[PDB]
């Protein structure tokens, strides 16, 4: 009983760990099938409802089965991740904290910076009896004990590492105990180390890939209430496919510079909007009705929206979407305004993005 259940548990864990990647890739295929079926999803007429158009009539049961399958596969993918990749993360974290304890004295000579979540959360696992559960070195507590025991206090180090004080002495000496059996639930409760599992769960919840898979599960669940949430699962192509990563790295290699270029463009357009609001306002009427104007630069905010949206998306600049300046006192000024906008924003500022992408490629 208490052994057969563990054997079957291990069998299931091994199966899911082995097939983590297979189900991970099957989820993408199911998401693509769902989103291809969704391309035949019409709207029919207030309280309006979305209808799945179908000549065969096989479209809707297939969609429901595929959604249920996707949810099941997402759950199986989380289980497989926990079985397969979580132990590596725990091993690496345990190794890091052990080596910071030994060769840096992270909790003896120094302390964490009080704003490092990893450093503050690692305080829990030091006292645990199941420390290096995954890390091979089972003597890290003894090593730190020997290194820092004399100068910093043997009892202080023992309390910090959560080691035994006096039972080991008597057990090397003479003592007697009574046995137990695995069937005792109290024995199982004593065997389970609550604090170490608490720290492990914290580390797993802080893991960035487990969080991503949980988000995948959350949108798979939401897809049952609204079938269009399965479209967010097509963002998984970047992670699932590795050849698309080469293309996407060109954008993300100079990612900070691409954001700063957009910020610089925003500042330049704000300066142009200030100039227009102060000098060129009569040219921003966007209505053909003579009676009622559509003055788009009578407000600072509105003129800035106009310049950032219409002027930036225009292929010739802001001068392609405003009144012609011919026969006006500010004609050469407007011409210079438009030409400089076209050169600096449409031509130069939009060229920096191209250059950044091509430089990332190179």
């Amino acid at each position: 009983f208490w052994k057969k259940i563990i054997a079957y548990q291990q069998k299931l864990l091994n199966y899911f760990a082995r097939n983590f990647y297979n189900m991970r890739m099957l989820a993408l295929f199911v998401a693509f099938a769902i989103n291809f079926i969704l391309l035949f999803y019409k709207v029919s007429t207030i309280a309006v409802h979305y209808v799945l158009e179908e000549s065969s009539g096989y479209m809707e049961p297939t969609l429901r089965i595929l959604a249920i399958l996707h949810t099941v596969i997402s759950f199986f993918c989380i289980i497989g991740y926990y079985c397969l990749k979580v132990p590596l993360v725990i091993f690496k974290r345990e190794k890091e904290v052990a080596r910071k304890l030994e060769f840096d004295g992270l909790y003896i000579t120094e302390q964490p910076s009080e704003d490092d979540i990893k450093g503050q959360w690692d305080r829990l696992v030091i006292n645990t009896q199941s420390f290096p559960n995954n890390y091979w070195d089972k003597f890290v507590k003894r090593k730190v004990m020997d290194k820092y025991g004399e100068f910093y206090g043997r009892d202080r180090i023992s309390e910090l590492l959560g080691m035994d004080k006096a039972a080991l002495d008597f057990s090397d000496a003479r003592e007697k105990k009574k046995p137990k059996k695995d069937s005792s639930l109290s024995a199982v409760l004593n065997s389970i180390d609550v604090k170490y599992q608490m720290w492990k769960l914290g580390v797993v919840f802080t893991d960035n890939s487990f969080l991503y898979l949980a988000w995948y599960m959350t949108m798979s669940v939401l897809g049952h209430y609204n079938n269009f949430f399965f479209a967010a699962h097509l963002l998984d192509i970047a992670m699932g496919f590795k050849t698309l990563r080469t293309i996407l790295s060109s954008v993300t290699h100079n990612g900070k510079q691409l954001v700063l270029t957009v910020g610089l463009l925003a500042v330049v357009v704000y300066l142009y909007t200030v100039v227009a609001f102060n000098f060129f306002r009569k040219f921003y009427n966007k209505s053909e009705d003579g009676d009622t104007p559509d003055m788009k630069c009578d407000d600072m905010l509105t003129c800035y929206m106009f310049h950032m949206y219409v002027g930036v998306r225009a292929g010739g600049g802001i001068g392609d979407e405003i009144e012609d300046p011919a026969g006006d006192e500010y004609e050469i000024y407007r011409i210079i305004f438009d030409i400089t906008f076209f050169f600096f924003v449409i031509v130069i500022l939009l060229a920096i993005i191209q250059g950044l992408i091509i430089d990332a490629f190179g």
């Binding site: 259940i5 759950f75 503050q120 769960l201 919840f205 487990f210």
Partner: protein
């Protein structure tokens, strides 16, 4: 300085090597303050010079502004300069840097809440997750599992991970709540 000179000019003398270990603490204390350069001496031979580096000089050298100046100087000499002016440009940069750090020395005379909230959310949510086990009411599920079945085992296997996923969702919601309470 005497011991370092003797050791570096007598690199294989065992008596001096065993004598040096008797001065490790002094040599370790004076290590950051011990200057060491190499020059082409008047005897037409490469000679090593030992001098003193002050703590103030080192601290002003390690300032970020001086680091940026050094980086720019190195870039300029590597790209726009030649070997035929390298040591002249280096001496000019050294003079400017020395003046700047002397001036800096004389003019200089003598979130956490979010991290704590996230840690509290982790603690609270994980404790709530572990309270099913800390409740000691496992007798009900034991009586359910008395009629052991593969279906029941698989259901419990899936339910454990479903509970983990719900705990993560609750933790995420608590994180959003803490962030929204802190900003407002």
């Amino acid at each position: 300085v005497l011991l370092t000179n003797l050791s570096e000019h007598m690199p294989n003398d065992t008596r001096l090597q065993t004598f040096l270990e008797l001065a490790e603490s002094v040599l370790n204390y004076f290590q950051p303050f011990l200057g060491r350069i190499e020059i082409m001496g008047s005897a037409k031979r490469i000679e090593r010079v030992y001098f003193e580096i002050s703590e103030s000089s080192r601290t002003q050298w390690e300032k970020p502004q001086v680091k940026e100046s050094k980086r720019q100087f190195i870039f300029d000499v590597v790209n726009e300069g030649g070997e035929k002016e390298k040591m002249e440009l280096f001496v000019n940069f050294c003079e400017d840097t020395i003046f700047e750090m002397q001036l800096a020395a004389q003019i200089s005379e003598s979130s956490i809440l979010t991290v704590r909230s996230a840690l509290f959310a982790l603690r609270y949510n994980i404790l709530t997750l572990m309270r099913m086990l800390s409740l000691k009411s496992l007798k009900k599920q034991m009586k359910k599992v008395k009629k052991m079945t593969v279906k029941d085992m698989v259901t419990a296997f899936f339910s454990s991970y479903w509970s983990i996923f719900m705990t993560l969702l609750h933790f995420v919601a608590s994180v959003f709540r803490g962030f929204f309470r802190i900003i407002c």
